[PDB]
Each structure stands twice: as structure tokens, then as C-alpha cells.
Design a protein around this ligand. Sequence first.
Ligand SMILES: Nc1ncnc2c1ncn2[C@@H]1O[C@H](COP(=O)(O)OP(=O)(O)OP(=O)(O)O)[C@@H](O)[C@H]1O
Ligand SMILES: Nc1ncnc2c1ncn2[C@@H]1O[C@H](COP(=O)(O)OP(=O)(O)OP(=O)(O)O)[C@@H](O)[C@H]1O
Ligand SMILES: Nc1nc2c(ncn2[C@H]2C[C@H](O)[C@@H](COP(=O)(O)O)O2)c(=O)[nH]1
Ligand SMILES: Nc1nc2c(ncn2[C@H]2C[C@H](O)[C@@H](COP(=O)(O)O)O2)c(=O)[nH]1
Ligand SMILES: [Cl-]
Ligand SMILES: [Mg+2]
Ligand SMILES: [Mg+2]
Lengths: 343, 343
Amino acid sequence: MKNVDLVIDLQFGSTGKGLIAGYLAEKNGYDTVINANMPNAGHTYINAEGRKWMHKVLPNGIVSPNLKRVMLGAGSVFSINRLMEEIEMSKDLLHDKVAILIHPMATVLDEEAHKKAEVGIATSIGSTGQGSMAAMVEKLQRDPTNNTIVARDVAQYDGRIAQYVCTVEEWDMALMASERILAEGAQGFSLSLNQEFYPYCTSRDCTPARFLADMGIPLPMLNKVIGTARCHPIRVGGTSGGHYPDQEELTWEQLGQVPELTTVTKKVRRVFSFSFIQMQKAMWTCQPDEVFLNFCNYLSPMGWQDIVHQIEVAAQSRYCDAEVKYLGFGPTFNDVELREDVM
Amino acid sequence: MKNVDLVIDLQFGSTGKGLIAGYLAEKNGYDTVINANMPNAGHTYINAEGRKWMHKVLPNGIVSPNLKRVMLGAGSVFSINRLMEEIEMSKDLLHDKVAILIHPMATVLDEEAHKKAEVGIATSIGSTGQGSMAAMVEKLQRDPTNNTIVARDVAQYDGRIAQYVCTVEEWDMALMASERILAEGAQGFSLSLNQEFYPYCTSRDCTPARFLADMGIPLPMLNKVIGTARCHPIRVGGTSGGHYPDQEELTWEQLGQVPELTTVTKKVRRVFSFSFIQMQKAMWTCQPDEVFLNFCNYLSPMGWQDIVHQIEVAAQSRYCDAEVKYLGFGPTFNDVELREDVM
Ligand SMILES: Nc1ncnc2c1ncn2[C@@H]1O[C@H](COP(=O)(O)OP(=O)(O)OP(=O)(O)O)[C@@H](O)[C@H]1O
Ligand SMILES: Nc1ncnc2c1ncn2[C@@H]1O[C@H](COP(=O)(O)OP(=O)(O)OP(=O)(O)O)[C@@H](O)[C@H]1O
Ligand SMILES: Nc1nc2c(ncn2[C@H]2C[C@H](O)[C@@H](COP(=O)(O)O)O2)c(=O)[nH]1
Ligand SMILES: Nc1nc2c(ncn2[C@H]2C[C@H](O)[C@@H](COP(=O)(O)O)O2)c(=O)[nH]1
Ligand SMILES: [Cl-]
Ligand SMILES: [Mg+2]
Ligand SMILES: [Mg+2]
């Protein structure tokens, strides 16, 4: 037990979870990396040598030097095409002594039907329109005649995932056999289905409890929660929802920064000032032990040092002993500073 | 912060959670009782005086002598009619100093549309066909024009719940302000969406992680998990799913018991021998601290004493220090024995 480090987002997503996941994977050498991603979530890790991993399926933690298991949780919604591609792109890391385990109930994304089902919400709620919820809904239908939604069933006619699809027992045994686990949450605290921005939110809760549930991680296994934040939280472009009372929407030109986009759609990310309210809210339910404060490169030292003190008191106020341990000044491994080294 | 006692079911549901919830509520005097029930779950508590509470919405813990808050989680799917009936039937317990808090994102069941949507699975997967998932799916749609699915929106035109529907802040504050919390899980571990019986399962995981997530309970708030089990696990009637390799389907006549009828459908419950495999599986992910072993009245002392030893070694085998603390010999408060007193 107590061997799971879970990376969660404290804001509305895209805080740099892919970066801290890959950074911690390299630093801590987890033998097991696990997630429960849906296609709405792209995760980028760039190592010291400049190698980039943009993952929608595989954990970014596959960069761990002691990698034995790659686990794709039951809450996973994935494109097999994308998975194939991602495995291929890191086949050097995903060697013969690395077991890729797809939970039998992980959802196979029907790229045509599921993205087409989310065209409406892609404009109405600014949804990534990636088919995440449409896939999830098809799975929830629990139609016995539907052999095309869960990994277990898809493995029977689509041999590409057949070797990866495990049983629920193998799943549990893989977690039991793991020495140190990196659990990678996706999306963001405030994007949680049950946070206050409904319906301008995602299809699930983006909370440690939900991410552990979606990866089938027993609660005693949780060792550490590394919450991630940006100095200026973002939202996706469009009518993607409101913000907290203590924050204002900013422009990329107001920040003196190049407009951040959603990589494929190129929608300009919405950017907001830091929200203390959001932080207390995220601190209260996410209860991180450690905090990665990213995009410190968008602020002056006084600015990001201030947000560090804000996060830690927002933590303390919500009975959370969160320590901003990591600071991000760029998208690569080299840009992750130990907070104690820079302040 | 550890003040939440979470009641979970270790088998396929109807193990007597309602009973242990009401029993522990009376014994421990929680000021806050919380759940995230869907209409597929009916929980029965009978006190020492013979008063019965068959709850589909309200926690059974409302019988707590120190009750201050009744909380209906965001994962809740409820009929307002049923909620009103249960409030009415317990209006003496739910006085002016008792705050009923319905999470703003708790789902309001559309009895006609949602039950109609689950007619197929009510026969195909033996689903309670109560509209649980159809309500959940409507909520997941996140259509901004849909003002009729979440409690927050429904409270705006349906005044019956208006006083109960809180904000996400009030929700968090109500949990923060609570001294001792009784979290009541529903359904059963093996009914979990991501357990091996898919699609013969429920619309979510019935795991502590999912239950805490669905009630918006921060993980550090978890004090203890009371797992519940029957000596002979049941399933609902019909084509409700398989069983474990170490268990066999029995008849009520084989057990010398009057045929038990499903909470929702008047259908005869399917009954199985005790499954050690099921227990290890439930012990592994549910990780109960305490176990309530119910329906001991269906076995001889040697029989239920054996299942006690089986549960505790199934626990130990899955790194779980679960202690069968409670034994059930009937449906009332008087029938809950301390295991140390009877063996
Ligand atoms: N400090 C930084 N400065 C500049 N760019 C950065 C920094 N940290 C990360 N990035 C980049 O900004 C984006 C952050 O999104 P990324 O997908 O890595 O985050 P995430 O938290 O994993 O997202 P998701 O919400 O999908 O879970 C990526 O394109 C990443 O390369
Ligand atoms: N030991 C017992 N002997 C006989 N009947 C009992 C016993 N314990 C509980 N019951 C009855 O068994 C039935 C099933 O229990 P109940 O509906 O409360 O289960 P539950 O575990 O709370 O439900 P669910 O699966 O919906 O979450 C009820 O009618 C209850 O009163
Ligand atoms: N930045 C970011 N936004 C996301 C992610 N997942 C969901 N969202 C946001 C986009 C919208 O504001 C809202 C609805 O999106 P979707 O879950 O794709 O239906 O949630 C994610 O991983 N990152
Ligand atoms: N005994 C019992 N069965 C349930 C409960 N919730 C769901 N189920 C079972 C009935 C079916 O076998 C299956 C699917 O049901 P449903 O969740 O109602 O769609 O799960 C519950 O609380 N108790
Ligand atoms: Cl107790
Ligand atoms: Mg991103
Ligand atoms: Mg029941």
C-alpha cells in the first residue's frame, strides 16, 4: 500500500500534468504508470534532450527508467489508432519487459460516432468534442448486444489491443505487484462534472477520489497527491464556462505571451488571473501533498512567489498541508525547478 | 480530518447496508449523514421499536440522535416525489435544526423518460430499470438548454427542492463543518461498472473511491470503511449476470429460507453460495476496516463463523486489516450483534 503518487489538476486543466508526470517518472522511477484518460485530454512531456510525448492515451510516466507496467484504467476512453501510434512512438520505452495493461472495461472510442455526437457541445459548452462522454454513455448503456464499446469485447475482433486487454484480476494483481505507482489524472479540478460550472464542465469529476476510482486504485494505495496549477489558469476557447468571483479573464497580449492553443483545433485558450477561491476549492477536495506551480515563466519572480504563498495558505485554510515543491518555467524537464532552489 | 465512516457493499448489493447505516447512525450519533444514491438502490433500516425506513433517496443514517445535516451527493439520482415522501415519513427526525442539502448537481429523475429508457436493460441485464443511468446520461449530455436535469436548475421552477438545493460551496462547508460523517454507499462491489460482470453491472463503480467522489468527500476525510456482506450473496432476479468461479447459484428452498424478493421488482432474488474470490476482490479494492456480516440467520453458527474467518483471511490476503466487527441475524437494530459477543 501507500505507493501511488497521483498527479491531479487544481484548476481548469492544461496546467502541465504531462510535464510533472514525465518529470516525476524520470526522478522517481515508478515501475507502474497508470491513468484513466479520455480523448479530451492531451498531455505533453518534453525531456532534457528535447524529446516530446504528446499523449491522449498512454501515461507520460512511460519515460520512467524502471517502467514495468503501463496501465490504462477502466475510466479510459481511447482511440485504438492513437494508442497504436503512441505505443509505436515509444516502442523503445515500451520494450518486451514492459506490460501494457488495458483494463477490460476501458472504453474504445468510435472516432466517427463519438466525435459526431459531441459536435453540439463542442460549440455550446466549448467541449473538446473528442467523444469522451459519447463513448462513456455508450458504455453506461450496458446493452449486452453491444460488443464494440469495452476493451474486453473489442479485443475479440480487434487483435491490436487483444495482447494488452487484461482481466479485472490481472488489473488488481498488476497494482498489487507494483512497487511505486504514478497515477496520472487528467483535465482539471474546476472542470469536474460536479464543480459549480455545470454544464460547462467535463463528463466526470477530476478529483483524486474519482481518478483513483477510474484507475481502480484502492484508496490505501494512495501515497501522495501532486496537485498542479498555472499562475494564470486557462479554459478552452469558446463558451467554455465562467470563472471564480476573484478572477478575471485576461488576454494573451495582456500577459505578453504567445496565444496558447488547443493543438488540433487551434482554438485559443481562455486565460484568467490566479484564483485563490479556485485554489481553496481545489485544496479542499483534492487535498494535494505537493504542488507543481507551472507557467511561472509568464510572471516575474514576485508574481509567481506570491502565487506560491497563496497556494500554500489556500491549502492550510482547507486543512491541506500542500507544499509547492515544484515550479515550472517552461514545457521541458529542464524547466521544472525545486521551489526550495528558486525561492 | 478523518471523520467519514463509509458503508460499502462487498458483494452484489442488498447485503443490509441500510441496517448497518441506521445501526451505526444510532450508535455513533453522526451529525452528518451523506449518500449518492440512485433509484436502483433501496435501503432498509428497522430500529429497535420496529419503525422501518425504506429509503431510495435519504440516507438511513437520518435516525442518528445528533443529526444536523442530511446530504444528497452530486452522484445522487432521485425522484423529487420519493424524496418528499421520505422527508414526510421522517419529518420528526428532519426537524428545523436538521439541514437537508441536495448537491446542486444531484440529478433529478424524470420518472417517465428515464424509467422508459431503461425498460430494455431491465430485462437484458436484469437492471432495476429505475432510470438511474438514463438520468446520469442526461446529466452527462451537459446541454446548456437543459434546465431540467440538475437539482440546481430544477430548484428554479420546482420549489419543493429549492430550500434543499445548496451551492457547491455550501456542500464543501457542510462537510467541513461536520464533526462525524456517515457516508452511505449503495449497490454492491461486484455490481461496479468496472468489475468483471460488465454489462451485467450498474452505471458506476461501487467502490469507496467512487462513493467518496460521488458525495464530494475529500479522501483525507475518510476515517473508516465498513464493508457489508451476506453469508449467501444475492443478485436481483432475471438475467442479472454471472457469478464467481467459486460460487454456485442456490435456491431459497436449498437454504431453508422464504424466497427473498428484490427491493425494486417483486422478482425473486437470485442467491449464491459465499464467494471467497468475490471477498478477496472486494477486500482488495474496497479495503474495509470493519465488516458487517449479515444474514447470519440463514446459516448455523459454524456456517457463519466460517464465513467470518474466510472474510478476514480474504482481507489479510489482499493487504486488508478488515475485522468482521458486526454480525446480522435479522433486519432490525436488535439483530446486529458485535462479532466479539457471539464468537
Ligand atoms: N511552464 C510552461 N511554459 C510553457 N509551456 C508549457 C509549460 N508547461 C507546459 N507547457 C505546454 O503547455 C501545454 C500544457 O498542457 P499539457 O497537455 O502538458 O497539460 P495537462 O495538464 O497534462 O493537460 P490536460 O488538461 O489535458 O490534463 C502543453 O502544450 C505543454 O507543452
Ligand atoms: N439479517 C437479515 N435477515 C433478514 N432480512 C434482513 C436482514 N438484514 C436485512 N434484511 C432485509 O433484507 C432486505 C435487503 O436489504 P437492503 O434493501 O437494506 O439492502 P442494502 O444493502 O442497503 O441495499 P442496496 O443494494 O440497494 O444498496 C431488506 O428488506 C432488509 O430489511
Ligand atoms: N484544458 C482542458 N480542458 C478540458 C479537458 N477535459 C475537458 N475539458 C474542458 C473543455 C470544456 O471547457 C469542458 C467540456 O469538455 P469535454 O469534457 O471534452 O466535453 O471541459 C482537459 O483535459 N483539458
Ligand atoms: N441488489 C441490488 N442490485 C442493484 C442495485 N443497483 C443496481 N443493481 C443491479 C441490478 C442489475 O443486476 C444491475 C444493473 O442495475 P441498474 O443499476 O438498476 O441498471 O445492477 C442495488 O442497490 N441493489
Ligand atoms: Cl464505530
Ligand atoms: Mg492540455
Ligand atoms: Mg437493496
